């Protein structure tokens, strides 16, 4: 199981008195020796004001066409200007991406203006930024040290409420399949 990305990190509450360690973190990127991911500890609210501050600067973002926010999720302090938004699987919409079949990934901008006109698939969440693993790139050793690694599921990610997600994930079963290896185009 010594390969990060496309699965959750389960960390027992041995690391307490701090809100950044432990808990369930989902790694989406694969940086060879490391892997970038987003912490889905607990639903918190990053006010829309902070997004307004960001979108206000028309350099590499643009479009502050969003209506409201108040409770935006943060997956970490770095790349708070972007991150990645999750919704159920839909082969439509400008920004969608899925490895299997269950959900879709969207960039945190065009989805904000979509929030301006409330028309949801069924459920989704908006998270900005991710874990500062970029500075680490040592996730390999973290896996064998103490943290548990279990494969990611589309329902386990999204649809399994809040708390029972941990329970079911801790039960788990197994999965071993990597059918993806392509990178084309220069942009």
Topology:
Elements: E1 7-11, E2 23-27, E3 37-39, H1 48-55, E4 73-74, E5 85-88, E6 103-106, H2 110-115, E7 124-125, E8 127-128, H3 133-136, H4 139-145, E9 148-151, H5 154-157, H6 164-171
Parallel strand pairs: 4-8
Antiparallel strand pairs: 1-2, 1-9, 2-3, 5-6, 5-7
PDB class: structural genomics, unknown function
Keywords: GFT-NMR, protein structure, nesgc, alpha-beta, Structural Genomics, PSI, Protein Structure Initiative, Northeast Structural Genomics Consortium, unknown function
Assembly: monomeric
Written overview of the protein:
Pfam families: DUF179 (PF02622). The longest helix has 8 residues, at 48-55. The chain folds into two domains: 1-41 and 131-187, VC0467-like (3-Layer(aba) Sandwich), CATH 3.40.1740; 42-130, 2-Layer Sandwich (Alpha-Beta Plaits). The radius of gyration is 17 Å and the shape is globular. The chain has helices spanning 48-55, 110-115, 133-136, 139-145, 154-157, 164-171, and strands spanning 7-11, 23-27, 37-39, 73-74, 85-88, 103-106, 124-125, 127-128, 148-151. The strands form three sheets. It has a four-stranded antiparallel beta sheet, with helices on one face. Strands 6-5-7 form a three-stranded antiparallel beta sheet, with no helix packed on it. A two-stranded parallel ribbon has the order 4-8. It is built from six helices and nine strands. It has 187 residues and is of the alpha+beta class.
Structural class: alpha+beta
Number of domains: 2
**What does the largest sheet look like?**
4 strands, antiparallel
Strand order, main sheet: write it out: 3-2-1-9
Number of strands: 9
- Quote the CATH topology of the largest domain: VC0467-like
Number of helices, where a helix is a run of at least 4 consecutive DSSP H or I residues: 6
Distance between the termini: 33 Å
Name of the top-level CATH class of the largest domain? Alpha Beta
Radius of gyration over alpha carbons? Answer: 17 Å
Shape: globular
Please state roughly what percent of the residues sit in beta strands, choosing from under 5%, 5-15%, 15-25%, 25-35%, 35-45% or over 45%: 15-25%
H-E order: EEEHEEEHEEHHEHH
The CATH homology group name of the largest domain: VC0467-like
Helical content band: 10-25%
Q: Which CATH architecture of the largest domain?
A: 3-Layer(aba) Sandwich
